[PDB]
Design an enzyme around this catalytic site. Structure first.
Site, PDB file in Angstrom:
ATOM      1  N   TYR A   1       1.065  -1.189   0.007  1.00 28.67           N
ATOM      2  CA  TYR A   1      -0.120  -0.035  -0.020  1.00 28.67           C
ATOM      3  C   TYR A   1       1.042   1.320   0.165  1.00 28.67           C
ATOM      4  CZ  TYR A   1      -2.952   3.469   2.366  1.00 28.67           C
ATOM      5  OH  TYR A   1      -3.758   4.659   2.590  1.00 28.67           O
TER       6      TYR A   1
ATOM      7  N   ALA B   1       3.988   1.596  -0.755  1.00 32.45           N
ATOM      8  CA  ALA B   1       4.604   1.755  -2.058  1.00 32.45           C
ATOM      9  C   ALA B   1       4.152   2.353  -2.769  1.00 32.45           C
ATOM     10  CB  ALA B   1       4.971   0.371  -2.229  1.00 32.45           C
TER      11      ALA B   1
HETATM   12  N1  LIG Z   1      -9.258   5.340   6.461  1.00 28.60           N
HETATM   13  C1  LIG Z   1      -8.244   5.502   6.844  1.00 28.60           C
HETATM   14  O1  LIG Z   1      -7.763   5.657   7.928  1.00 28.60           O
HETATM   15  C2  LIG Z   1      -7.056   6.351   5.657  1.00 28.60           C
HETATM   16  C3  LIG Z   1      -5.847   6.731   6.207  1.00 28.60           C
HETATM   17  C4  LIG Z   1      -4.963   7.347   5.125  1.00 28.60           C
HETATM   18  C5  LIG Z   1      -5.461   7.563   3.786  1.00 28.60           C
HETATM   19  N2  LIG Z   1      -6.678   6.981   3.477  1.00 28.60           N
HETATM   20  C6  LIG Z   1      -7.235   6.989   1.952  1.00 28.60           C
HETATM   21  O2  LIG Z   1      -8.344   7.641   2.007  1.00 28.60           O
HETATM   22  C7  LIG Z   1      -9.123   7.213   0.776  1.00 28.60           C
HETATM   23  C8  LIG Z   1     -10.320   6.375   1.077  1.00 28.60           C
HETATM   24  O3  LIG Z   1     -10.057   5.653   2.207  1.00 28.60           O
HETATM   25  P1  LIG Z   1     -11.526   5.248   2.913  1.00 28.60           P
HETATM   26  O4  LIG Z   1     -10.995   4.382   4.292  1.00 28.60           O
HETATM   27  O5  LIG Z   1     -12.460   6.084   2.911  1.00 28.60           O
HETATM   28  O6  LIG Z   1     -11.713   3.642   2.172  1.00 28.60           O
HETATM   29  P2  LIG Z   1     -12.971   2.614   2.276  1.00 28.60           P
HETATM   30  O7  LIG Z   1     -14.021   3.161   3.152  1.00 28.60           O
HETATM   31  O8  LIG Z   1     -12.417   1.295   2.383  1.00 28.60           O
HETATM   32  O9  LIG Z   1     -13.573   2.743   0.680  1.00 28.60           O
HETATM   33  C9  LIG Z   1     -12.809   2.560  -0.772  1.00 28.60           C
HETATM   34  C10 LIG Z   1     -13.596   2.866  -1.786  1.00 28.60           C
HETATM   35  O10 LIG Z   1     -12.696   2.325  -2.655  1.00 28.60           O
HETATM   36  C11 LIG Z   1     -13.639   1.540  -3.698  1.00 28.60           C
HETATM   37  N3  LIG Z   1     -12.907   0.520  -4.391  1.00 28.60           N
HETATM   38  C12 LIG Z   1     -12.302  -0.683  -3.811  1.00 28.60           C
HETATM   39  N4  LIG Z   1     -11.814  -1.560  -4.752  1.00 28.60           N
HETATM   40  C13 LIG Z   1     -12.012  -0.949  -6.019  1.00 28.60           C
HETATM   41  C14 LIG Z   1     -11.658  -1.131  -7.244  1.00 28.60           C
HETATM   42  N5  LIG Z   1     -11.102  -2.236  -7.580  1.00 28.60           N
HETATM   43  N6  LIG Z   1     -12.194  -0.320  -8.256  1.00 28.60           N
HETATM   44  C15 LIG Z   1     -12.697   0.826  -8.013  1.00 28.60           C
HETATM   45  N7  LIG Z   1     -13.147   1.173  -6.683  1.00 28.60           N
HETATM   46  C16 LIG Z   1     -12.760   0.404  -5.681  1.00 28.60           C
HETATM   47  C17 LIG Z   1     -14.608   0.906  -2.700  1.00 28.60           C
HETATM   48  O11 LIG Z   1     -16.057   0.448  -3.230  1.00 28.60           O
HETATM   49  P3  LIG Z   1     -16.349  -0.667  -4.153  1.00 28.60           P
HETATM   50  O12 LIG Z   1     -15.911  -1.857  -3.313  1.00 28.60           O
HETATM   51  O13 LIG Z   1     -18.088  -0.554  -4.051  1.00 28.60           O
HETATM   52  O14 LIG Z   1     -15.534  -0.727  -5.227  1.00 28.60           O
HETATM   53  C18 LIG Z   1     -14.890   1.954  -1.653  1.00 28.60           C
HETATM   54  O15 LIG Z   1     -15.956   3.153  -2.538  1.00 28.60           O
HETATM   55  C19 LIG Z   1      -8.026   5.865   0.329  1.00 28.60           C
HETATM   56  O16 LIG Z   1      -7.103   6.447  -1.092  1.00 28.60           O
HETATM   57  C20 LIG Z   1      -6.921   5.843   1.456  1.00 28.60           C
HETATM   58  O17 LIG Z   1      -5.631   5.591   1.093  1.00 28.60           O
HETATM   59  C21 LIG Z   1      -7.456   6.495   4.432  1.00 28.60           C
HETATM   60  C1  LIG Z   2       0.753  -0.620  11.649  1.00 30.82           C
HETATM   61  C2  LIG Z   2       0.220   0.803  11.209  1.00 30.82           C
HETATM   62  C3  LIG Z   2      -0.080   1.970  12.280  1.00 30.82           C
HETATM   63  C4  LIG Z   2      -0.614   2.961  11.424  1.00 30.82           C
HETATM   64  C5  LIG Z   2      -0.981   3.161  10.159  1.00 30.82           C
HETATM   65  C6  LIG Z   2      -1.704   4.434   9.547  1.00 30.82           C
HETATM   66  C7  LIG Z   2      -1.468   5.655   9.788  1.00 30.82           C
HETATM   67  C8  LIG Z   2      -2.166   6.740   9.013  1.00 30.82           C
HETATM   68  C9  LIG Z   2      -2.773   6.380   7.647  1.00 30.82           C
HETATM   69  C10 LIG Z   2      -3.048   5.129   7.580  1.00 30.82           C
HETATM   70  C11 LIG Z   2      -3.584   4.544   6.335  1.00 30.82           C
HETATM   71  O1  LIG Z   2      -3.073   5.084   5.126  1.00 30.82           O
HETATM   72  N1  LIG Z   2      -4.436   3.620   6.537  1.00 30.82           N
HETATM   73  C12 LIG Z   2      -5.254   3.084   7.759  1.00 30.82           C
HETATM   74  C13 LIG Z   2      -5.335   1.556   7.917  1.00 30.82           C
HETATM   75  C14 LIG Z   2      -5.931   0.853   6.670  1.00 30.82           C
HETATM   76  C15 LIG Z   2      -5.371   1.255   5.400  1.00 30.82           C
HETATM   77  C16 LIG Z   2      -3.852   1.191   5.520  1.00 30.82           C
HETATM   78  C17 LIG Z   2      -5.770   0.797   3.966  1.00 30.82           C
HETATM   79  C18 LIG Z   2      -5.392   3.127   5.367  1.00 30.82           C
HETATM   80  N2  LIG Z   2      -2.348   3.996   8.338  1.00 30.82           N
HETATM   81  C19 LIG Z   2      -0.735   2.064   9.406  1.00 30.82           C
HETATM   82  C20 LIG Z   2      -0.251   0.984  10.042  1.00 30.82           C
HETATM   83  F1  LIG Z   2       0.124   0.060   9.194  1.00 30.82           F
END
Ligand SMILES: NC(=O)c1ccc[n+]([C@@H]2O[C@H](COP(=O)([O-])OP(=O)(O)OC[C@H]3O[C@@H](n4cnc5c(N)ncnc54)[C@H](OP(=O)(O)O)[C@@H]3O)[C@@H](O)[C@H]2O)c1
Ligand SMILES: Cc1ccc(-c2cccc(C(=O)N3CCCC(C)(C)C3)n2)cc1F
Ligand SMILES: NC(=O)c1ccc[n+]([C@@H]2O[C@H](COP(=O)([O-])OP(=O)(O)OC[C@H]3O[C@@H](n4cnc5c(N)ncnc54)[C@H](OP(=O)(O)O)[C@@H]3O)[C@@H](O)[C@H]2O)c1
Ligand SMILES: Cc1ccc(-c2cccc(C(=O)N3CCCC(C)(C)C3)n2)cc1F
EC number: 1.1.1.146
Lengths: 264, 279
Positions: A158, A160
């Site tokens: 992820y 990466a």
């Molecule tokens: N949540 C966190 O703590 C956190 C932290 C840092 C960054 N982020 C970033 O926030 C963004 C949104 O995160 P989230 O936590 O809100 O995600 P989430 O609640 O898991 O939702 C992910 C979304 O992507 C869609 N998706 C999954 N696989 C897909 C595919 N193959 N093609 C098209 N759409 C697809 C899913 O819907 P379907 O399954 O219906 O396709 C869903 O709408 C991401 O880029 C993530 O890296 C999140």
């Molecule tokens: C061991 C550990 C501790 C903390 C974090 C951390 C911090 C800030 C943002 C995120 C992040 O991008 N997330 C939240 C987790 C689900 C994901 C990976 C799909 C998206 N992750 C990740 C860790 F792997």
């Protein structure tokens, strides 16, 4: 200084918009009076989001269902989304392939898939969206993570893919600056967000305060509206103090005097 | 005599002071070794008395490097040719290499797919190939090498660039791949830490180097002093040998002054207390 009126009447794409932050962003834009086209794989969920957006006051709202594993889909979706709205002002890139915390051993398929979905598809979407954004002097919003700025165990693939986005989008941002492509690129660096998906993945492994997704969604939109280069959103005040890399900005500036781009 | 001999080179100060003798008899793979920095590393390793297996697509060029490595004083030297575009070849090559040397001490990931300086428009094919060759193949080689590296408490050496740490226009795809290497490898380094996998990971962040390939690509575009490939190659070996996490090598003293990111290390250390890995 952000004002909600900045999104009024704007044509906006939100990917990964069926749940989490993407869905929140759809709702905020809906309230702001923007035109929206949301995407994700789940047609049924998208339908509900679309309906709620119209309820919230969106100038217009549509969904197109598909998988971002399919580069042809990604490409056609942009064209189709732009046709529905009669253009595009902001491209919000937010989806990721499904991921959990695990030690990396030998799952090369997940590392490949993560690069394909979390990175490659963002590029295809950008290439497809560019002529419309150029015409509107619009914006690209790229959703990243703290894991795309610093290292964490358990999310090698992820991380990466988030690192890659920085390197790719930060490069073209400098290219655009020189070729006079008036399209902003905002890299969003989020900490832990209280989404259902993340809260389950970190259960019992990570003990830190998850920030609210409604607010996270807004800060992302804000960053795009203001054409900021980077957006930093985390619970901890120590993250906000240490996250930035001023030395990196200085170095890029120092190197800029050592190369000549007039020749395209 | 070798059967009646024993001991260790790595005593007090060895984590600080490199000695060529540290590579003596070590079993080393170098990828992208038919030319430039990789070739220079092959040569240095030869002189140090290491066993080496080199790779690249060009069989004839590889042959020449091998011959010169044996001349130079290498314990043994072999080559296997093939493209790192083929993940099957990357995987088998590690096994073949390990078998030729009877083990593995150091894995030097150095090849990349050919790249020039160009504005990014719509070449998705180059972006994908860049990710496959410059990043994905490093992972596949790492997976294949790990059992043997674990047995020897060996090292992984990842060759990167300043463009894998800060942004540059005209190398969007290349830079994406170099940034991917840091994110991936920095993550498994923390993973190896906690799971007691005594395998070091050295990320090498190089400025402009005077290789034929680089000097051609930057001609008329970039106007900077290029650093010598011979010494760059040595600083890479040194880093791996001393088990250092990052090696920084560039012509400007301003690079060396600003390139490190102590704030990232502080953050990583602060975040380490917020997660439990025992399981
Ligand atoms: N949540 C966190 O703590 C956190 C932290 C840092 C960054 N982020 C970033 O926030 C963004 C949104 O995160 P989230 O936590 O809100 O995600 P989430 O609640 O898991 O939702 C992910 C979304 O992507 C869609 N998706 C999954 N696989 C897909 C595919 N193959 N093609 C098209 N759409 C697809 C899913 O819907 P379907 O399954 O219906 O396709 C869903 O709408 C991401 O880029 C993530 O890296 C999140
Ligand atoms: C061991 C550990 C501790 C903390 C974090 C951390 C911090 C800030 C943002 C995120 C992040 O991008 N997330 C939240 C987790 C689900 C994901 C990976 C799909 C998206 N992750 C990740 C860790 F792997
Ligand atoms: N040169 C610089 O200024 C500079 C700056 C920063 C970082 N670096 C890094 O240093 C490393 C080597 O750079 P260099 O300038 O020394 O490169 P180079 O002289 O062009 O050598 C590249 C090597 O990789 C091989 N190669 C190319 N395509 C391949 C493929 N598909 N499969 C397997 N091998 C392949 C080449 O052999 P064949 O063509 O015969 O296959 C050659 O042995 C790279 O990681 C590069 O990013 C270089
Ligand atoms: C406009 C521009 C672009 C790239 C650089 C730069 C600086 C340090 C190292 C490198 C690097 O990794 N190289 C050198 C070029 C051939 C490559 C890209 C295959 C390898 N590249 C400098 C610039 F001014």
């Amino acid at each position: 200084e952000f004002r909600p009126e900045m999104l009024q009447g704007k044509k906006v794409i939100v990917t990964g918009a069926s749940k989490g932050i993407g869905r929140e962003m759809a709702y905020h834009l809906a309230k702001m009076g923007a035109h929206v086209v949301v995407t994700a794989r789940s047609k049924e969920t998208l339908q509900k989001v679309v309906s709620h957006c119209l309820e919230l006051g969106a100038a217009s709202a549509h969904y197109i269902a598909g998988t971002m594993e399919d580069m042809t889909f990604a490409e056609q979706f942009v064209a189709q989304a732009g046709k529905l709205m009669g253009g595009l002002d902001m491209l919000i890139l937010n989806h990721i392939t499904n991921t959990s915390l695990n030690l990396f051993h030998d799952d090369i398929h997940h590392v490949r898939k993560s690069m394909e979905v979390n990175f490659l598809s963002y590029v295809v979407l950008t290439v497809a969206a560019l002529p419309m954004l150029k015409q509107s002097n619009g914006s690209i919003v790229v959703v990243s993570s703290l894991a795309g700025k610093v290292a964490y165990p358990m999310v090698a693939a992820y991380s990466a893919s988030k690192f890659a986005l920085d390197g790719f989008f930060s490069s073209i941002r400098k290219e655009y600056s020189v070729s006079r492509v008036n399209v902003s690129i905002t890299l969003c660096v989020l900490g832990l967000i209280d989404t259902e998906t993340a809260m389950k993945a970190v259960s019992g492994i990570v003990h830190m305060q998850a920030a609210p997704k409604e607010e996270c969604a807004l800060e992302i939109i804000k960053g795009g509206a203001l054409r900021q280069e980077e957006v930093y959103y985390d619970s901890s005040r120590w993250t906000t103090l240490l996250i930035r890399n001023p030395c990196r900005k200085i170095l890029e500036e120092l190197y800029s005097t050592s190369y000549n781009m007039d020749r395209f």
